[PDB]
Amino acid sequence: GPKRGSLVKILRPESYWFNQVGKVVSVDQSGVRYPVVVRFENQNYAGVTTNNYALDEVVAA
Amino acid sequence: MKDFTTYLSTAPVIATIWFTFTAGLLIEINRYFPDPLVF
Amino acid sequence: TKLFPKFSQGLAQDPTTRRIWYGLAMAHDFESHDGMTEENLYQKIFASHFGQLSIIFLWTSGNLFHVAWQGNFEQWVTDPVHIRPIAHAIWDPHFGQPAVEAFTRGGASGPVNISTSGVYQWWYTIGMRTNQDLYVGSVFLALVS
Amino acid sequence: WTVPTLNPDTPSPIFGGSTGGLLRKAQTEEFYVITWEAKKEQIFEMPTGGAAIMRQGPNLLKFGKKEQCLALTTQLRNKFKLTPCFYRVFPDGKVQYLHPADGVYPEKVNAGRVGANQNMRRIGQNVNPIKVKFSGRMMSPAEI
Amino acid sequence: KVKIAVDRNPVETSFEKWAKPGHFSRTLSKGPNTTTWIWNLHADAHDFDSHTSDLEEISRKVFSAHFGQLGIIFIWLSGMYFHGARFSNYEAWLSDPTHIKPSAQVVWPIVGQEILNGDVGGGFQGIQITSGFFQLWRASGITSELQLYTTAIGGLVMAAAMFFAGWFHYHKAAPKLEWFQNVESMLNHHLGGLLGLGSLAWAGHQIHVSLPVNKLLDAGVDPKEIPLPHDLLLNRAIMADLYPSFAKGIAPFFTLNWSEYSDFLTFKGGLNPVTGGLWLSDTAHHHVAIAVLFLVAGHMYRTNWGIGHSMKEILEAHRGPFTGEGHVGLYEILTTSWHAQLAINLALFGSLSIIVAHHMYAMPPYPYLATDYGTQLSLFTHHTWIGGFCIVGAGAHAAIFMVRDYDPTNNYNNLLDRVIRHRDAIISHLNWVCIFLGFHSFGLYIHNDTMSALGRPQDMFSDTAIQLQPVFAQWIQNTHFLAPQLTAPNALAATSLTWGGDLVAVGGKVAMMPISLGTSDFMVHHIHAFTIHVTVLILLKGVLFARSSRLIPDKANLGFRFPCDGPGRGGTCQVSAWDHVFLGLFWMYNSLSIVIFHFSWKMQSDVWGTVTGVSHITGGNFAQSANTINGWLRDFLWAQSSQVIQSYGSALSAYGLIFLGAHFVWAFSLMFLFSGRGYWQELIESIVWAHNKLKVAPAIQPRALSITQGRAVGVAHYLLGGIATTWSFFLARIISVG
Amino acid sequence: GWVTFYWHWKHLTLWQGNVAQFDESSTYLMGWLRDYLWLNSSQLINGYNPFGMNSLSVWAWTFLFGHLIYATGFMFLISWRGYWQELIETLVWAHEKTPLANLVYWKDKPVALSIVQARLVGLAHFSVGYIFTYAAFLIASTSGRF
Amino acid sequence: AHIVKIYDTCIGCTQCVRACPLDVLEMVPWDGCKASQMASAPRTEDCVGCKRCETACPTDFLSVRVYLGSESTRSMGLSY
Ligand SMILES: CC1=C(C/C=C(\C)CCC[C@H](C)CCC[C@H](C)CCCC(C)C)C(=O)c2ccccc2C1=O
Ligand SMILES: CC1=C(C/C=C(\C)CCC[C@H](C)CCC[C@H](C)CCCC(C)C)C(=O)c2ccccc2C1=O
Ligand code: SF4
Ligand code: SF4
Ligand code: SF4
């Protein structure tokens, strides 16, 4: 995936951050299904600012 | 002292000040121009 | 596990009173019933409509009859102003002489409610005159019921 | 680790008896019992209320429902590193190891528990309720 | 071994954390991101037990908080006095009380609110007050508004001193825990110093100022004519003239011939016929008695010499066979938690204010007091409401302590422990006794209304049909009336014209009369007792199910305040002791409303009126219209609503306006008390779509209120609406008809 | 409720004659209240009295009955389950532990109402009381005055 | 018994297991996450629905939910 600190656009319909943009913390070089790690700056309905995603679910924008 | 100034610029104080200003203005207006309805 | 809510066997196994409550609650939710098929559902709604028709017919014929029996119609038609219509005979072993007397004054010899249901105006307007005809109409509506 | 065996003869702790006591549920459909052993002798807090003293060594108690055993389990586990386990006692006394079992508490993973009730999928990937319709009982698409 | 201990410069004086909101909680101090942040910030500003866990820290905090409260009170008092000095018709009312009505609050000649400046007499305009400061001041001896002025100035100075003391004893020289724990010293000091010397100096002021000048006023001499207090002090000749004992100084008292001082240390009983007040010599003797009693009481406990008692030793000495270890450890619990003290004290305080209201309407102590029926009613109901609230708060903080700071180990076989044991039997018993009282008492009223509207009043419950008589109360009244002949032979009269006797009237107005008791009053008293037991049941469950429950066995760790435990095991909404206090407050409101209604109707109907005999304001419709609900509604309420619903174009338009506003907000509370935050959050989200589409979404995320927040806002609004409605109605009605 | 109130007031004023009174007292809420309800209430609350009764006693009674239905359904609407559940628990302990009462034993076990069940029963009580009170008032006014 | 359902996003942080007051859960070895653990709910008949677990699980779209079902002596957790 894109190098760390890069900025992508979440697209998973269910995701509280849907159709939004967040900062990629890092990506696992290994083969876990959701190696993407995305910080945010607006906590969801439980107080979390970083979520995990697969590759496709995001767009680097 | 700057701490104190920022304490002033906190929100509720500024809200009170702006509302006091607006209300005082309206009151003085209705004093000097009693019971207007037209124009 | 008692056959309470039949259509809902799980509740039929519930040993709490919520069994009774919800078994009452979902009685007619035929979508949420056991072995519910489409033609089943349809024939059920069909019987339901029949039931509704019968109920409404009974309602109308019952008001017809109660008037035809204990009303002041055939006097009412004469003066459509100072005749208030009689609703239905009042009967109660509790009411004292004051209430009987007070309730008696308003219709005829006996306590009665004063119907405010416009049926008098309607029926007389359509051509209803005599209690005989009201009896006829009531019994015929019950036939259709 | 091996499954323990409920010894019905265990010194019950020091307690003056309270209201949360015996019901007829034990003689009707089910009831429960817990056990453990203490390092020293000490006072503690009865879950159903009242003050009780744990006896130095083994102890035995009686609870109707299960969450009470759960709660006293948690208490002893947290406050003195203690380790209890318990037993569902059926109508006809069919002892059933409710505690221990896996031999190790499920806080730490353990090879041998088979992954159960799991769906290797997300939850947005469930089907519309229009399609689950027409069953003898009402099913939620979540199960399929 | 007890002494004084202190610590220096514990906390500086700076605005640093003033610029740091939420500094007191390391949690909140990390910043806001959602709305509910603000709610929480306001909510737990004073939750000292959750701030930190140092006893000494929380202790210094509550000390300085006390000082703040004190300063505020002094401020408001000085404000009252200055208003009375500068914007009142007080001197006119001093000239004539009987026709000039007190008025101190004046309005400004603006867009139209000047119509309220009611002609209260004395060539004066404004708004009638009910507080009674006029009669109080006359009782004391204030004549010159100069005195009110200097009094207000001194009060302000005292408020400043209180604030300074708070700042000092928090930031510069803070005390220590044991010095906060020296409880025997504290009780000795309070009971002796405070109350003893208060009553003593009170007796002194009464004697040397308020007795003579009030003798003169009642003699009718011109007010400003009467000499000055310092002249009264200086010239023993004048006081000798007034009371021939004063010539002898103090030697006769010293020689133990106290009888000679009886000239102005009297035991009259009864009232003062010219003013309707109690006899000032009698109150002076009373206060002297209280003074010596409490000052002797202030010499009980040991502090630094073996003489005196040890509270803990006395406590343990009382143990019982049926009870096990008895009172052991209570000295600990009390010497260790603020919340136990707060619970006990609030309970006693509320009960005491209730007793104050009752005693005060019973035996009016001020001159010309009995006249203003409006003032009487107002004082009574106000103090009653305050008592109810204090008692509910007692219950609340009791349960709060029980959850938070109780310890099981220290109390193995305690009275406390065994109570916790048989809580189930206790609660079940209380339940049944309540439902029994409810059934009987209220079904009586419904049976009455049915026997009426059916047309058979022959079978109702009144003084006419099948009767019910407060035989016990009539007996007690009889006995207190006949007491002084034999029981207190040196008592010259009953201590209240309510025990029976003649009628004292002033200015064509009744001041008191023996009060009848009817089947009506029986039934009303029993309704009172039922609702009281019900409230007590709510709160006692709230406290005895604090730690755990047969439903939730881990209630303790979940804290004192929380919405539910989810829909689990059938739905767990409203299970916290906080919600217990919620509903208890509800029922408290209901009970107090009913009791003040009882009081108002009884007074208006069968005591009040003017002398011709007497002419009761409703002529006594009570004892026959108060035992049916329809009669209640129509003849009392729907009746007396007249002046309040026609108060327009007059200085009473405000009362009707507030009547309306109170109905409004009272209804408005119901949306909160019924809705559910999930729906609110969804609608909020759609609104956020709307805003954000214009790129105007707020940086602070919008979150619907918390569940408990919805509950609390609902209850506050509802209570406000109800009590405001009844307040406006009472004031308008009684001021119109009296 | 609003629409029916308005219709009723204007038609009362029509049948009586002082429609000017409607056009004047109908532009301010205090006029609405005092002149329309408190003014038209006088007869009903007198349907009976400590004196006797009349044809309107029953309507006054139904007025009061609806008020009670309403004020009781409020308890449903506001209080929620877990509280009553704890209650019923203590209660059942009492019922079985007191002597000579444990003899009989019910079949279906006692619990408080589910959330939705309680909400619905409360709404029912509310609406019933509401409609009863208003209907009684309206009919009493129109008939006892015309 | 009330219904339970895990999902592939079970990160195995055990907060489900760390929360349940009814031992309706346990952690098994897994592969799809780095913790190599997926929560497992093998004892549905003792869940009462208290939803402490659904309160826990930090997966963005939850991971493991509960659904309400019929009742019994065993199920509802009623002491009588
Ligand atoms: C109406 C309602 C809401 C919605 C009401 C909310 C969120 C409160 C709104 C408060 C005000 C009106 C908004 C914020 C005001 C601040 C001062 C911000 C500045 C606003 C400027 C205009 C000054 C709930 O959230 C709720 C929650 C739980 C039970 C019942 C209810 C409930 O009934
Ligand atoms: C009082 C109360 C109870 C206790 C009340 C219960 C369990 C029901 C009591 C029923 C009584 C004993 C008899 C019911 C009388 C009805 C008129 C029955 C009608 C039957 C129809 C078939 C006609 C709850 O269960 C509850 C649950 C959730 C929120 C609020 C509350 C609540 O306030
Ligand atoms: S949100 Fe309300 S209904 Fe839902 S579990 Fe919590 S208290 Fe119960
Ligand atoms: S609902 Fe959640 S917390 Fe309750 S038992 Fe089931 S998994 Fe555990
Ligand atoms: S579902 Fe959530 S709490 Fe449970 S194991 Fe997976 S990540 Fe942990």
SSE map:
This is part of a larger assembly, with one copy of chain A (61 residues), one copy of chain B (39 residues), two copies of chain C, one copy of chain D (144 residues), one copy of chain E (738 residues) and one copy of chain G (80 residues).
Chain B: H1 2-9, H2 11-32
Chain D: E1 14-15, H1 25-28, E2 31-38, E3 42-45, E4 51-54, E5 57-63, H2 67-80, E6 85-89, E7 96-97
Antiparallel strand pairs in D: 1-4, 2-5, 2-6, 3-4, 6-7
Chain E: E1 6-8, H1 36-43, H2 48-51, H3 55-86, H4 90-95, E2 103-105, E3 118-121, E4 124-128, H5 133-140, H6 145-171, E5 173-175, H7 177-181, H8 183-219, H9 229-234, H10 236-242, H11 251-254, H12 280-297, H13 311-317, H14 330-334, H15 338-362, H16 373-404, H17 415-454, H18 471-486, E6 504-506, E7 509-512, H19 519-544, H20 577-606, E8 610-611, E9 614-615, H21 622-625, H22 629-645, H23 653-674, H24 677-693, H25 707-737
Helix pairs in contact in E: 3-6, 8-12, 15-16, 16-19, 16-20, 16-25, 17-19, 19-20, 20-25, 22-25, 23-25
Residues 563-564, 566-567, 571, 573, 707 of chain E line the site of one iron/sulfur cluster.
PDB class: photosynthesis
Keywords: membrane supercomplex, light harvesting, electron transport, green algae, photosynthesis
Entry title: Native Photosystem I of Chlamydomonas reinhardtii
Q: Could you give a quick summary of the protein structure above?
A:
Chain B: The chain crosses the membrane at residues 7-27. With 61 residues, chain A is mainly beta.
Q: Within the largest sheet of chain G, what's the order of strands?
A: 1-4
**Cofactors and ligands present?**
phylloquinone, iron/sulfur cluster
Major sheet description of chain C: none
What distance separates the N and C termini of chain C?
Answer: 39 Å
Structural class of chain G: alpha+beta
PDB class: photosynthesis
Keywords: membrane supercomplex, light harvesting, electron transport, green algae, photosynthesis
Entry title: Native Photosystem I of Chlamydomonas reinhardtii
Chain A: Photosystem I reaction center subunit IV, chloroplastic
